[PDB]
Structures are given as structure tokens and as C-alpha cells.
Design a binder for these strands. Structure first.
Ligand code: K
Ligand code: K
Ligand code: K
Ligand code: K
Ligand code: MG
Ligand code: MG
Ligand code: MG
Ligand code: MG
Ligand code: MG
Ligand code: MG
Ligand code: MG
Ligand code: MG
Ligand code: MG
Ligand code: MG
Ligand code: MG
Ligand code: MG
Ligand code: MG
Ligand code: MG
Ligand code: MG
Ligand code: MG
Ligand code: MG
Ligand code: MG
Ligand code: MG
Ligand code: MG
Ligand code: MG
Lengths: 131, 132, 56, 327, 50, 81, 171, 49, 101
RNA sequence: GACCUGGCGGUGCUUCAUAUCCCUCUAGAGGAGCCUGUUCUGUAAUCGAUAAACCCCGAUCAACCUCACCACCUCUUGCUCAGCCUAUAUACCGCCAUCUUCAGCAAACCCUGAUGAAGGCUACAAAGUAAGCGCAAGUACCCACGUAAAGACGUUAGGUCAAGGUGUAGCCCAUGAGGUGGCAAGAAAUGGGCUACAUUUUCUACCCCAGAAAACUACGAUAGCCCUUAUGAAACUUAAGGGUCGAAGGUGGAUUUAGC
């Protein structure tokens, strides 16, 4: 198949009323659709309980809710690695300091991973959906 | 007298669509089915879960697009895919339609764990089959 | 992730959407196999059928 | 002033299709007709109405039992109802001298036929049926009453009974349709030959839930084999054997043919009735045409439609009702 | 594709069942529903795995 | 681009037009599988096929060389599982 | 249960009880008749009790040439929106409670002497704007039918006149 | 799982994304019963004692 | 949020019956044979009788999933005859039509 | 006082009813036993239907559960941004009965009655035209037949707040929720059905060319009693089988049902 010259890009709804009619509408219509997808994703992650019934066979990992909060509450080096993997710049630093104050040994590799996270983001929280 | 799904004659001023104008004894004669899946075929399984999904989807779409739907939904299932075909009105702004399409497709895909598509057809006004 | 962004473009046609879903694992892989993704721990047939070893 | 709620746009809003609208519908059909040929990969110039129906049936498969509810792509002239043109011009003068009757077409026809009868007086079948009412209304594009239709047909009969000229006969034939009379003549089976060159004729029969296939040989000794078993053994009941004898006895050919039949389904009596039909139809090949007609008039070549009647809910049987209690 | 295919139509299956027509009492009055299953058997022959 | 109509017509009426016609929306159409598309599709799919062994002309030959036959069944239904 | 909820049309049809056995043969009085109220009138798509601002639905998609992000109105800000909504409803309801002064005829509850306005215009661009109509009598006549018994009909006498000599009446 | 369905659609209503015509109907009825005086009493501190 | 308290009691029974299904199956097998000693089979009789009452599968009721009606339910759709007819008569159940013959 | 419309008349004439009104045709019910409803009576112990149009009816179904009943015990923001099988089907939606084994209901106009309630046809025609709905036509099943389906507007404030939803009123330490146990019987009457009273029968073989049986050891219980088994956690109770037992019943009063 080749491109259909009479049709607008496939992403848009193929309907005379909904089809974009300008270069600005083209951009705004996609942005509105992306906003809708973002709102749904926010709800899905805000209330995972509602979307935890897995009925798909084979299992689809991508259609499951995402959990972004650290699930290990113990103050330990192994527990700190989780926060670095989750990219919690503030939690990792606060925990790393607490770990250092307690006096437990932090592996150079773990500290290097913390610097990588801190150096890349400049000690600023990565943009999130909403707080 | 039979009552089931019969819009009753009035003074000749009630507009009815083609689906609303046909009583249940026409469901395989003049009108088709609003849902197509395999659950109700001989030797097929999971008819109960397909029905609960259909009932929910029709309520979800009625409240998600308040006042926009111009007729009943057409639910289509092919393999893993779920296709919702809705005839809507041309009153709500297109921006709001695109937001609701992206929102409903995403929210329903995560709820029923399958790729869901929503195909909207706009009509200027409700299509009147006859006046009862 | 930046290298993925430069090659990123919107879906061009229906086939492309089907391909993306297949790669993401959303759509079923054809021809349909009713045991796709389910393995009973790679158990052999003799493990299921012959259970006398456990009765020792 | 008390404002009476004013009527909206007429709800009934009977749809009228003006001539310009129809002209636009024809252009749409011709353009759509070319796309449909392009879709199916056929020549746009030789795409007929029967190919259009075949293409639409494939592209839009509809199983609806009523064919008038299925997707259709026909010429607007066959879809839209034939509408009468405007009968008066801009000045307002109607175009027909019998306009104010309300039935200018009908009464103009009556006037013409009456005139022809006057001139004829001053000057002096089986296949054809008189045009029915619903079909005459279409010609005239007028709504007629049952009694109006009678009056008109009576005038035509008066015309036909009296001597008519070349022109008068042609006019009458305008209102006569053709009736294709089905022939009640039995269709003979094709006489076949086996490996040994013996003539035989295979046929089929059906009775209730039984179905028999009979092979009647042109020459034989009178041996009948049912499912590979001799007929008296397969049919111990005398009534069943009586039915097997009815076809051959009626044509007076007992002992002159050998039959080999296979019957499955039903009961003993239904099976005997099915074999009787199969044997009678097969035996028609070797009897004369006149004898075949006698077989038909005796009931030996008709499939008995009497089958079991279903049971309906709320009743004890097909017709049996539950005991009724007045009080 | 060069495949040898033969098509035949197996006999259809109609499954019928009855329900009460009214919400309460009126046992004599029933509504009967059916589900029709039609078949078409496509028989390929002499194929390879690919 | 077809003036296709569908719907049982009212008295002195015509089948409903295609716009807003829910009966046409209910049909599983074959507009994507026209004879032109099918022939073009299969032309691209010939590269994936392998050639049946010419030696195994008849079923009797198949039985002689391959005596065992294994029957299995796959079921294609609609749904999430 | 979410699966036991019906639509507004079904809920109002049952609650109003406009079609029943109590409205056939003058079996029910007219005082307790309740009126339908469309509860979707003042509702905006995207407005909820939590006060979230959905870009592209509840609020504009782009602000200052940039796509807005999901936001939530503050507690005090939502209270204002909720309070205003209550006020808007009260005003709309107030409009319906207001009674328009109807010019009475010969008596407060009499139809005699009430103007019906000008006669309706004809189908061929004919107008009767000069003529005035006034009711003279309104009677509830009855006949008896085999199926329903008493069948109520209205007999009305009106008089039309332009005030310049031309006047008529009809039933 | 009637909990998931009922709770999900209740959350979506409070978020402004689902219009529950039924729940709106019983909110107007419950609102008119307060103005009429037919309000639900306090638990424990009821008419009886 | 279930239709009524009766549905809610059946929901708990189906859950408890599932949790004890293996334990009940194992003990019953000891009872449903003539091989094992009667003394051992008598102890099993008491053990399965001491399990919670709501773990007994016979106490489960197939109620309509939409209206909780305990009778007139079609097992294939799990709907009461009144609810099934409402969906079927509106053309919302794939392939189900009125039967006439 | 005189009329309009309808109903009704043991009201006239004429024509008809096709399982149908009568005369006719066939098998039944009303008698016996048993199964299963209902009414009465009984029980601490549901509810609804209950002339035609209730009575193997809501139930394509109750040992616990189901359950809404009774006794006792327990819980109080309660599976639910509560709950209520509490009252009101004479507030309703929803789904239906009934005439219907009908063919009528009709908006919008026009005309008649002196511009009253109302009425509106004559075909060699004299004021009716009529959208729409139903019938019809089409469609399902094996046909164009038949059977299904369909069958309007209305009638019986007909049935159903106990499918679910819901207006009004009532309960909120209880008219709500949970646990354990328990009742669902028969003085009596009666509806529907099942099996019989036998010789066109009983038993066996066979599935229609047989041998026996044939009146106090015959025909006749699917009841009673005993035992076993099936399902279940639970069976004197539900079901199946075997043994034992061998009763009324000898063709049924007034009357009554169904079938082309
Ligand atoms: K009797
Ligand atoms: K009886
Ligand atoms: K209520
Ligand atoms: K109990
Ligand atoms: Mg009926
Ligand atoms: Mg019979
Ligand atoms: Mg006053
Ligand atoms: Mg049970
Ligand atoms: Mg008796
Ligand atoms: Mg009772
Ligand atoms: Mg009662
Ligand atoms: Mg019972
Ligand atoms: Mg109990
Ligand atoms: Mg209670
Ligand atoms: Mg009533
Ligand atoms: Mg017919
Ligand atoms: Mg019928
Ligand atoms: Mg009909
Ligand atoms: Mg009543
Ligand atoms: Mg009652
Ligand atoms: Mg209580
Ligand atoms: Mg016997
Ligand atoms: Mg016994
Ligand atoms: Mg046991
Ligand atoms: Mg004896």
C-alpha cells in the first residue's frame, strides 16, 4: 500500500467534522489527544487497584499500572539502590545522608550511581505527571 | 399486549431512529446486532464475560460523552482487538472530542487489558427514520 | 532514548499501528497459538504422568 | 394576547423528490458505478447491474432474512417512487382539461376508450391476464379505487368483445400481461446403462423423515431388494408390502422389473412410503407418457407434505390444549 | 498462493430455548430464543509448514 | 465513494442513505479485501512459502514415506484471552 | 451497584407517572403533578467535585503558547466554584417560580374575553395581522364510546374582527 | 467485581470525566428532601431512645 | 457495592469455598474409599465437618450477576430471565434472535 | 320537556359460526391409589397469584444455603460517600394477562345540522380527502399451504414495590446487619396430572408368522416396610436399585375438558 493522497494523516479521525483543516488545527488536535492519554495515565497510576484484574492471555506487561514509589522502607544500602533506580533525586540524597550518618558502608558503585543520577539531573526532580 | 423494546405510536410527532422503530421480532430480519463476538457461537466459551463488558462499555460511553451520542453503539471484537463505533453529534468542539477519544481508548485498554479503538462518526442531527 | 526520539514519527497507516502493537505485546501474534506465553515450567510429559518417584 | 403554542416544521414532512434532485442522484450513481468497477478490478464500461449486485453482496455481506433490508446500489429510477410532474405552469393554468377531476390520467383513459367504442359502433387469451390494480396505478401514476378499476376493465372487455381494428387491438394489449402457465407434466428420468448394458433409472423419494433411492431395471423378474435385504424380510408388516406393490400393480407391471433401493430414516411406514415414491418416479422412464399421467392422477408421483407439526409452548401438544377451567 | 483448496458447507446448528414472557405468574406465556450457527469447511491439501 | 443504501424502506420511501446509517456500520465489510488487494497481497507473500515435495504426488505415496499422522487443532476466538 | 443504574429518561418517566391508570378517567387530581427537570443543563464536561483542570477539556489546551499540565483548584477556589454553581441554580429556579401577569377576561378563571392573537397566516403568504381574536365560550362536551366510555371534547366559540366592519365567528 | 466497577465510576464522577445521570437524579431528590425537612437523622441521636 | 446483602453473602461463600477447596478435596478422598481403615476414616469425617460452614460448595447459589435474582438464571450468561430478555430484545447479545419455526 | 352518543334488550328480519352454538365424531376429567398445587384447620414460624384472564402459578424447582419466616444471641458510620423483601401495583417505569379464535384507532382539513351534543354512504354514486398505527403484505420453519411470529388505540385503577429501578410516607441501638437452631403438618375439602381396573390384556424372546399367563399366588402402587447405592460436610427426609408387601380399583353421580 502507498500513501492515500486524499486523506489527512492516519493519526487524525477520518471524519469531515473532526479532520484537521489547518496547520494549527493539526498540531492542536494531536496535542488534545495526547492530553487525553496523559489524563488517563494519571488516573491509572493514581488508582492502580481499579486496573489490577489481569484477564489478558498472554499477559501484557505494558497495559499494567506503574508503581513509582519505593517499596523498601528499611534504611540500608540495598534499599537505597531502589531510590536511585526510581530516579528519586531528593529521597536518594536524604536517604544517602541518613545512611552516612548511621555509619553503614555504602559501596562505591552505589555512590557512583547516585552521582550519575544527581549529575545528570542537576539535583532537580525529573518532571512528573502531577503531585 | 407485548411491550419489549417497542416505541409506541403517538400523535405523529415523536422522531425515532431506525433501531428504535423495529421491535424485537426483527432482530435478524430488518435490523442486525449491535455487538459481534464469538461467545454465543456453538462450542464457544466466555459468553458471560463478553456480556458484562458490553453492558459496561455502553454505560461508560453514555456518561463519558454526555449528550453527544446520536444512536446506539456498535461493539466489534476481532481476536484481541475491541472496536467501538459511535455515531456522535456535531455540537461538542473537536478539541474536546479528541481529548475524550484519547482518554477513553487509554483508560479502557488498561481496564480490559486489550487494544481498544474508538471510531467516531459525526452527524449534523439525529437521523430520523420515521415520525411515530 | 534520544536516539529513539530522532527516528520517532507518527503512525502512517493501519498496518503500522498493528506492527507497533505487536512489538509492544498488546496484539496477539499470528498464526494463533492457544498456548502462547504459557509454559508449565518447561515440564516434561514424564513428570506429569509418572508420579511414583514421589511415593518412595 | 394568549399565544397558542405555534406548530413547528411539519413533523410528518413527507419527502418529495424534485426532478433536479433525481438528476443529481443519477450522476452520483454513474460516478459510483465507476468506482465499484475500479474496486473489483473490472472494466468500467461493461459493468452491468448484475455485477453491481454481486460486488455489493461481497463488499457489504448482510445475512438479514428480508432482502429489502440489505444494502442496495440500484439506479435511482428503480429506487425512488415514480412521481407525477407539475400539472400547472407559472400562470396557474393546469395542463390537462380533466385536471380538476383529480384523476386526469384515469378519466382521460376512460374518455379515450369510450371514444373508440363510439367510432367502432359507427363503423360497424389464456396466456394474457387483465392488468391488476396495483400495476394499473403505476402506469397512470394515480391512486384508484377497487370500483374504479372494475369500471375500467369492464370497458376494455366491451372493447375486446366487439370487432376491433389494428389500432384498437394494440391499445388493448397495453393493459394485458403475460402468464407463464406451469405444466403439470412429470419429468422423466434419463435411462442409464450399467457395466453389463442393462437399462436402469435411478430416482429419489421422501416421506416424513425417511429418504429412499430406488434403481428400477427395465427388465427383471420382480425382485425387490431393500438395503440389501429381500423385501418381505425387510417389511414383515403386510401393509408395507402392499405399498410397494401399488406402483407396479397400477401400471400392470408386476414381475417385470427388478428394484434395488436403499432407505434410511423414519419408521417402517414412512420408509415404505418413501420407497413407493422413489420406485414410482424411477418406473416412469419405462412406462408410456399416458401411463405416467395416470400415475400422477392416482397420487403415485406426489411427495406427501404431511410432516409432524411442532409443539407450541403453553399447550400439551401441536393442537392439544391444557384442561380449561371456567372457574 | 498455489494452495489446493476444496470448500464444503457442513449442516447448520440451531439451539433454541424458552423463557417466561411476564415478570410474574402467567406461566402459559413464553418467549423463545435461538442461536443459529452456520459453518463453512475449507480443506487445504499438501501444504508445508511455512 | 459508493451511493450504497441500506434499511427496510417505509411506505413510499427508499432505503436510508449511507450517512448516519447504523445498519451499514453494523456489517463486517470487506472493503479492505477487494479482488485487486488480495492479488497484490498474495504477490508479496509468495516469498514466505515453501514448495511441497513433488515426489509426494498422491496420498498413497504420502503414507508410504510418512506412515504416522498427527492431528492437532487451534481455536481462533475473539476476546482478551 | 453500578450495573443497576438507569438513564435519566427512564428515571423521569417512572417518577413523573404521566402514563398510568390514574390519568385515564379523571382518576387523579392535577395539583400533585410534578415537572421534569433536566439535570444536565448547567453541567460542564470535565468539571468534578475534586476540581481538577484537564488541559483541552475543562480548561484551554494551551496557555501562553505552551501546553498546560494537569492542575487542581485550591480548596478555597473550589468552594467558590461550588458556591457560584448553587447560586446559578437558584436563579434559574427563581425564573421558573416567577408568575407572569396574565390579563384576565370576564373573570379570573374564565376564558371569555381573552385574546388569542392574530389568526395564523395562510400557506400562500397570506397574513391577518389586522384581525383580533377573542374567546366567547369554552365548554367541555362529552360523548359515549363503546371502548372508553366518556370521551371528553372541547367546544370553543371565538370571534374575529379587524375593527373596521369585518367580523366573523366560528366553532 | 462490583467493588471495582462501582468505585471506579464513582472516582471518575468526582474527577469530572463521567456524568452519572442516575446519581444526579438521586442527588436532586435528596436535596429537595432537606428543604422539605425529611433529612436523615443523626445516628444514635434518633427519634427513639 | 454489590446488588444486595444476599449477593454479598454469596460472594464471601464463593471466596471461602475457593480457599478451602484443596483441603476439602484431600480430606474427602480419605473418606470416599473402602481401602483405608475405618478408624482413620472416622477422624477424617470429623475433620471435614469442623471446617467453616461457608466453605461447603453446596451453599453457593448461582444468582443473577446484574440483579441478584436467585432463580430463572441462565448459566451460560449468568443473567436472570428478565435481564437476559432486556438485552436480547434490544439486539445487544451477539447472535441471539427470537425463535420462530 | 325534547334530543345526541354509547351500552343493553327473555329485541325483529336476513346471513352465518367449522373444533364449533346445537345435533353429530374420538379420547378423557368427575369414582380408586399415588404425585403435586390451593382452600381451610394447625404451627413460635414467610410473601405473591387466587371469575373467564388463580390453582406443577413467580419456581427451566425450598434437606443447610436458597430465605424474605420463627426463637435465642450478637453488631452499631455498618459489603456501599450506608442500609430497609418497611407501607402504598390506587403514584410509576420495566415486563405481561385479557377481549384478540378482533379490525379498528386516527392527526390535519373540508362539508352537514339555522355554526347544539354530534354526523359524513349510495359506482347508472348523493361530501368527504385523509399522513400515521394495526390488520394485510413481507419474513422464520419443509412451498404460494399450514404452524409460528405479529396483533394497534383502548377495556378490567387487571398482575407484579418480593426481578431490578423508582415518586410519596415511615424506620435509623433497628422495620437495618450477622451467627446458631428450628417450622414447612393433615381433621377435612378441592384443582391439575400419573398409574390402573385388564384379553386390542399380563410375562418372556423378538422388535410385529412365537411360547406361556389369564381371578383370593390373576390384572393392579412410581404407596408402606427393610436393605443397598448415588450426591453432599450433613439424607428417618433427595434420587436410583433390590427385596418384601399384593391394598383400593371391576370403567366411574350431577357435571365437565380437548381435538379438523
Ligand atoms: K374418570
Ligand atoms: K384428576
Ligand atoms: K418504593
Ligand atoms: K438458618
Ligand atoms: Mg401474548
Ligand atoms: Mg397427543
Ligand atoms: Mg380569581
Ligand atoms: Mg443449591
Ligand atoms: Mg380422581
Ligand atoms: Mg400460599
Ligand atoms: Mg393475597
Ligand atoms: Mg414444589
Ligand atoms: Mg431453609
Ligand atoms: Mg428485613
Ligand atoms: Mg393495576
Ligand atoms: Mg403464510
Ligand atoms: Mg401466537
Ligand atoms: Mg401480520
Ligand atoms: Mg388493583
Ligand atoms: Mg394484589
Ligand atoms: Mg432486623
Ligand atoms: Mg404392569
Ligand atoms: Mg415399591
Ligand atoms: Mg455418604
Ligand atoms: Mg400379582
Amino acid at each position: 500500500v502507498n500513501r492515500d493522497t486524499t486523506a489527512v494523516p492516519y493519526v487524525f479521525q477520518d471524519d469531515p467534522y473532526l479532520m484537521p483543516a489547518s496547520s494549527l488545527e493539526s498540531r492542536s488536535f494531536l496535542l488534545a489527544k495526547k492530553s487525553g492519554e496523559n489524563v488517563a495515565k494519571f488516573i491509572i497510576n493514581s488508582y492502580p487497584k481499579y486496573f489490577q484484574k489481569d484477564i489478558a492471555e498472554p499477559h501484557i506487561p505494558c497495559l499494567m499500572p506503574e508503581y513509582f514509589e519505593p517499596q523498601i522502607k528499611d534504611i540500608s544500602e540495598a534499599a537505597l539502590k531502589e531510590r536511585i533506580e526510581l530516579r528519586k533525586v531528593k529521597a536518594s540524597v536524604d536517604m544517602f545522608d541518613q545512611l552516612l550518618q548511621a555509619g553503614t558502608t555504602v559501596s562505591l558503585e552505589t555512590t557512583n550511581s547516585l552521582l550519575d543520577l544527581l549529575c545528570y539531573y542537576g539535583d532537580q526532580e525529573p518532571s512528573t505527571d502531577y503531585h | 399486549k407485548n411491550r419489549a423494546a417497542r416505541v409506541r405510536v403517538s400523535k405523529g410527532d415523536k422522531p425515532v431512529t431506525y433501531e428504535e422503530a423495529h421491535a424485537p421480532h426483527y432482530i435478524a430480519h430488518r435490523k442486525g446486532w449491535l455487538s459481534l463476538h464469538t461467545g454465543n457461537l456453538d462450542g464457544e466459551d466466555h459468553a458471560a464475560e463478553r456480556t458484562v463488558e458490553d453492558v459496561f462499555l455502553r454505560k461508560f460511553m453514555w456518561g463519558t460523552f454526555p449528550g453527544c451520542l446520536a444512536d446506539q453503539l456498535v461493539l466489534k471484537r476481532r481476536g484481541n482487538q475491541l472496536e467501538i463505533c459511535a455515531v456522535v453529534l456535531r455540537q461538542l468542539s473537536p478539541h474536546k472530542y479528541y481529548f475524550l477519544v484519547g482518554y477513553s481508548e487509554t483508560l479502557l485498554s488498561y481496564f480490559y487489558k486489550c487494544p481498544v479503538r474508538l471510531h467516531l462518526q459525526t452527524v449534523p442531527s439525529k437521523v430520523v427514520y420515521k415520525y411515530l | 532514548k534520544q536516539l529513539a526520539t530522532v527516528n520517532e514519527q507518527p503512525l502512517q497507516n493501519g498496518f503500522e499501528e498493528l506492527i507497533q502493537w505487536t512489538k509492544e505485546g498488546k496484539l496477539w501474534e499470528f498464526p494463533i497459538n492457544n498456548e502462547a506465553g504459557f509454559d508449565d515450567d518447561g515440564s516434561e510429559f514424564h513428570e506429569h504422568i509418572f508420579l511414583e518417584k514421589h511415593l518412595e | 394576547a394568549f399565544v397558542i403554542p405555534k406548530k413547528n416544521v411539519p413533523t410528518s414532512k413527507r419527502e418529495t423528490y424534485t426532478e433536479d434532485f433525481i438528476k443529481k442522484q443519477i450522476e452520483e450513481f454513474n460516478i459510483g458505478k465507476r468506482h465499484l468497477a475500479n474496486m473489483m478490478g473490472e472494466d468500467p464500461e461493461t459493468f452491468t447491474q448484475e455485477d453491481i449486485d454481486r460486488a455489493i453482496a461481497y463488499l457489504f455481506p448482510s445475512g438479514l432474512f428480508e432482502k429489502r433490508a440489505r444494502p442496495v446500489m440500484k439506479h435511482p429510477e428503480q429506487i425512488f417512487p415514480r412521481q407525477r410532474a407539475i400539472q400547472w405552469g407559472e400562470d396557474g393554468r393546469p395542463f390537462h382539461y380533466l385536471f380538476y377531476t383529480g384523476k386526469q390520467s384515469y378519466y382521460s383513459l376512460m374518455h379515450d376508450v369510450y371514444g373508440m367504442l363510439l367510432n367502432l359502433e359507427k363503423h360497424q387469451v389464456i396466456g394474457s391476464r387483465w392488468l391488476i390494480k396495483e400495476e394499473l396505478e403505476e402506469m397512470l401514476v394515480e391512486k384508484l379505487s377497487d370500483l374504479d378499476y372494475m369500471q375500467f376493465i369492464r370497458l376494455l372487455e366491451k372493447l375486446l368483445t366487439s370487432q376491433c381494428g389494428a389500432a384498437e387491438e394494440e391499445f388493448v394489449q397495453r393493459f394485458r400481461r403475460s402468464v407463464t402457465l406451469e405444466s403439470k407434466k412429470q419429468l422423466i428420468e434419463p435411462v442409464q446403462y450399467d457395466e453389463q448394458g442393462m437399462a436402469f433409472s435411478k430416482s429419489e423419494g421422501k416421506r416424513k423423515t425417511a429418504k429412499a433411492e430406488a434403481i428400477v431395471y427395465k427388465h427383471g423378474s420382480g425382485r425387490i431388494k431393500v438395503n440389501g435385504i429381500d423385501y418381505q424380510l425387510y417389511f414383515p408388516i403386510t401393509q408395507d408390502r402392499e405399498q410397494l406393490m401399488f406402483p407396479f400393480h397400477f401400471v400392470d407391471r408386476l414381475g417385470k422389473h427388478d428394484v434395488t433401493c436403499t432407505v434410511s430414516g423414519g419408521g417402517r411406514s414412512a420408509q415404505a412410503g418413501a420407497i413407493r415414491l422413489a420406485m414410482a418416479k424411477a418406473l416412469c422412464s419405462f412406462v408410456t407418457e399416458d401411463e405416467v399421467e395416470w400415475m400422477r392422477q392416482a397420487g403415485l408421483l406426489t411427495t406427501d407434505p404431511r410432516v409432524r407439526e411442532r409443539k407450541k409452548p403453553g399447550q400439551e401438544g401441536a393442537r392439544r390444549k391444557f384442561t380449561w377451567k371456567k372457574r | 498462493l498455489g494452495i489446493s483448496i476444496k470448500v464444503h458447507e457442513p449442516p447448520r446448528k440451531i439451539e433454541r430455548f424458552t423463557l417466561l414472557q411476564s415478570v410474574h405468574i402467567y406461566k402459559k406465556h413464553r418467549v423463545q430464543y435461538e442461536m443459529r450457527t452456520l459453518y463453512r469447511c475449507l480443506e487445504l491439501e499438501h501444504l508445508t509448514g511455512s | 465513494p459508493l451511493p450504497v443504501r441500506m434499511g427496510y424502506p417505509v411506505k413510499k420511501g427508499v432505503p436510508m442513505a449511507k450517512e448516519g446509517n447504523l445498519e451499514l456500520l453494523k456489517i463486517p465489510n470487506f472493503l479492505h479485501l477487494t479482488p485487486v488487494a488480495i492479488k497484490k497481497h498474495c504477490e508479496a507473500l509468495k516469498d514466505f512459502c515453501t514448495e511441497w515435495p513433488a515426489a509426494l504426488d498422491s496420498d498413497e505415496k504420502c503414507e508410504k514415506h510418512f506412515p504416522i499422522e498427527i492431528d492437532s487443532t487451534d481455536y481462533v476466538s475473539s476476546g482478551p484471552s | 451497584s453500578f450495573f443497576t443504574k438507569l438513564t435519566a429518561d427512564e428515571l423521569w418517566k417512572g417518577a413523573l407517572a404521566e402514563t398510568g391508570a390514574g390519568a385515564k378517567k379523571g382518576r387523579g387530581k392535577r395539583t400533585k403533578k410534578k415537572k421534569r427537570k433536566d439535570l444536565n443543563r448547567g453541567q460542564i464536561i470535565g468539571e468534578g467535585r475534586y476540581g481538577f483542570l484537564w488541559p483541552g477539556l475543562n480548561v484551554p489546551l494551551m496557555k501562553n503558547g505552551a501546553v498546560q499540565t494537569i492542575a487542581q483548584r485550591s480548596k478555597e477556589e473550589q468552594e467558590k466554584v461550588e458556591a457560584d454553581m448553587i447560586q446559578q441554580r437558584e436563579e434559574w429556579d427563581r425564573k421558573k417560580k416567577m408568575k407572569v401577569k396574565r390579563e384576565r377576561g370576564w373573570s379570573g378563571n374564565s376564558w371569555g374575553g381573552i385574546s388569542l392573537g392574530p389568526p395564523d397566516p395562510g400557506p400562500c403568504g397570506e397574513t391577518y395581522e389586522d384581525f383580533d381574536t377573542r374567546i366567547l365560550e369554552v365548554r367541555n362536551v362529552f360523548t359515549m364510546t363503546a371502548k372508553e366510555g366518556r370521551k371528553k371534547s372541547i367546544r370553543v366559540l371565538v370571534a374575529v374582527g379587524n375593527g373596521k366592519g369585518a367580523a366573523g365567528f366560528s366553532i | 467485581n462490583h467493588h471495582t466497577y462501582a468505585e471506579l465510576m464513582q472516582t471518575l464522577r468526582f474527577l469530572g470525566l463521567y456524568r452519572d445521570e442516575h446519581q444526579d437524579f438521586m442527588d436532586e431528590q435528596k436535596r429537595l428532601k432537606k428543604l422539605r425537612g425529611k433529612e436523615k437523622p443523626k445516628k444514635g441521636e434518633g427519634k427513639r431512645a | 457495592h454489590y446488588v444486595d446483602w444476599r449477593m454479598w453473602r454469596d460472594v464471601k461463600r464463593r471466596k471461602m469455598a475457593y480457599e478451602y477447596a484443596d483441603e476439602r478435596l484431600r480430606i474427602n478422598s480419605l473418606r470416599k474409599n473402602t481401602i483405608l481403615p475405618k478408624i482413620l476414616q472416622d477422624v477424617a469425617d470429623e475433620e471435614i465437618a469442623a471446617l467453616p460452614r461457608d466453605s461447603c460448595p453446596v451453599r453457593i447459589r448461582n444468582r443473577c450477576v446484574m440483579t441478584s435474582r436467585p432463580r430463572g438464571v441462565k448459566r451460560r450468561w449468568r443473567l436472570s430471565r428478565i435481564v437476559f430478555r432486556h438485552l436480547a430484545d434490544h439486539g445487544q447479545l451477539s447472535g441471539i434472535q427470537r425463535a420462530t419455526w
